[PDB]
Amino acid sequence: SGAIYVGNYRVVNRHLATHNDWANLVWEDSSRDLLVSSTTAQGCDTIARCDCQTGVYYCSSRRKHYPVSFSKPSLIFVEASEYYPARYQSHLMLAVGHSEPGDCGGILRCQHGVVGIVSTGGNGLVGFADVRDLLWLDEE
Numbered sequence: 001s002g003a004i005y006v007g008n009y010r011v012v013n014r015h016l017a018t019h020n021d022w023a024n025l026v027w028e029d030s031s032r033d034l035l036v037s038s039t040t041a042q043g044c045d046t047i048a049r050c051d052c053q054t055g056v057y058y059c060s061s062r063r064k065h066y067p068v069s070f071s072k073p074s075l076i077f078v079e080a081s082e083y084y085p086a087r088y089q090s091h092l093m094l095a096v097g098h099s100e101p102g103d104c105g106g107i108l109r110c111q112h113g114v115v116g117i118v119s120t121g122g123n124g125l126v127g128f129a130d131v132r133d134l135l136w137l138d139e140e
C-alpha cells in the first residue's frame with residue numbers, strides 16, 4: 001500500500017485505487033498502473049523533475065529503505081504473480097531489489113523529491129511507476 005500527496009492530489013497504484021479514489025477520479029492510465037484522485041486536505045510531498053537514475057525506495061515487506069540504481073521509464077514485460085494480465089506496463093523504471101505485491105505504493109525518492117511508486121516485483125527486480133513526466137501534479 002501507499003500514496004503520494006501533492007497539493008489537492010493523491011497518487012496511488014491504479015490496481016489498489018479505492019471506491020473513494022474512483023468517485024474523486026482526476027486522471028488514470030491502465031498502461032502506467034497510476035490513478036490520481038482529488039483530496040480535501042493540502043498534500044505536502046514534492047515531485048522530483050529530473051532524470052536521476054539513483055534514489056531510495058521504501059520496501060514495506062522488509063520495513064526498510066533501500067538505495068537503488070534504476071532504469072529510465074519504458075514499456076516492460078511483468079511476469080505473473082497474482083495480478084494484472086501478467087503483461088506489459090509502460091513508464092516503468094526497474095531496479096535490482098525486493099518487491100512483493102503488498103509493496104506497491106512504496107515511494108522512490110531522489111534529491112529532487114518523489115520519483116515514483118512501487119508498481120511491480122519478481123525475479124529479484126522492483127518496478128516503479130514514474131510520476132516525473134506528470135508536470136500537472138505541480139499546479140492546481
Ligand SMILES: CS(=O)(=O)NCCc1ccccc1
Pocket residue numbers: 014015016017018019022
Ligand atoms: C481493474 S480495476 O481496478 O479498474 N477494477 C475496478 C476496481 C473497483 C471496484 C469497485 C469500485 C471501484 C473500483
Ligand SMILES: [Zn+2]
Pocket residue numbers: 048049050051052110111112113
Ligand atoms: Zn532526481
